[PDB]
Amino acid sequence: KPNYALKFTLAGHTKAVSSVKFSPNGEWLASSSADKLIKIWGAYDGKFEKTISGHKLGISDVAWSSDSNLLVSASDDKTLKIWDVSSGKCLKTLKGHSNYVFCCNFNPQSNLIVSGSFDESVRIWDVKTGKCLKTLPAHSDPVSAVHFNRDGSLIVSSSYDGLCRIWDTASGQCLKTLIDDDNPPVSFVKFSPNGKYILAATLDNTLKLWDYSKGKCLKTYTGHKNEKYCIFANFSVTGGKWIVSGSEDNLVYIWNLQTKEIVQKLQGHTDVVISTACHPTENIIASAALENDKTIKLWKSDC
């Protein structure tokens, strides 16, 4: 089992934190917030680095380019913004969604961005030009998450409409719709690091690992509280192979991926833990919490 212990608490956002993400090169943590700001923090020491500003309304998600140089953020102002982290400049403002933008990611290559919106679509954008390339009529309710697979050829999306769908990046065609025996809102999805699986959260307090190719649910993770918020979930891969997620009882849950047992619960936050991220090389977890808390915490384990 891991032994995550609290190392730093990061204060600075003035409203609920919405997402935290570690840069691929391991140097930085980025955070986004309902306060319309992105903040950068040292990944190892928690030291505040800088604030990146410009959105007109709250931000629900932020994501790093694979070279750790750029961020993309998704906002209630109905835009995404692409940022040069070093200069703090907004390179492009991506206009096209007709309602709040909720989720975003670059492809592993980092020439494309995928976004999901309250407008029920998924859009794919050219990073260099900031132009929308394709609009997929993906869902019949808000899109909660979007993620590219390992080679960028597929996109997975999830929605309040109860579906996870997998899309061909190049053609835009729907290649698969995944749903289990009940239809709760799907609140998060992402491909596994090896690209074989999809990890999906549903708003019935459940995480599931699906074999994408087979269209089969292989593992269920339960024990946490998740009925209300779109809480991120992670694969922790630096030490033991875990699944990590925030929870609506203000804890971070960690499960053994293979056995599905809870291996640790991290206590310390004073509101719902909406987002967690796992460092790419060290056994470090960042967690972020909602309006009554407003902090980010860094936890470290020996394994």
């Binding site: 609920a16 309902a34 309304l57 709250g58 709040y100 909720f102």
Partner: peptide
């Protein structure tokens, strides 16, 4: 935003 609803 994600921090509501």
């Amino acid at each position: 935003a994600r921090t509501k609803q």
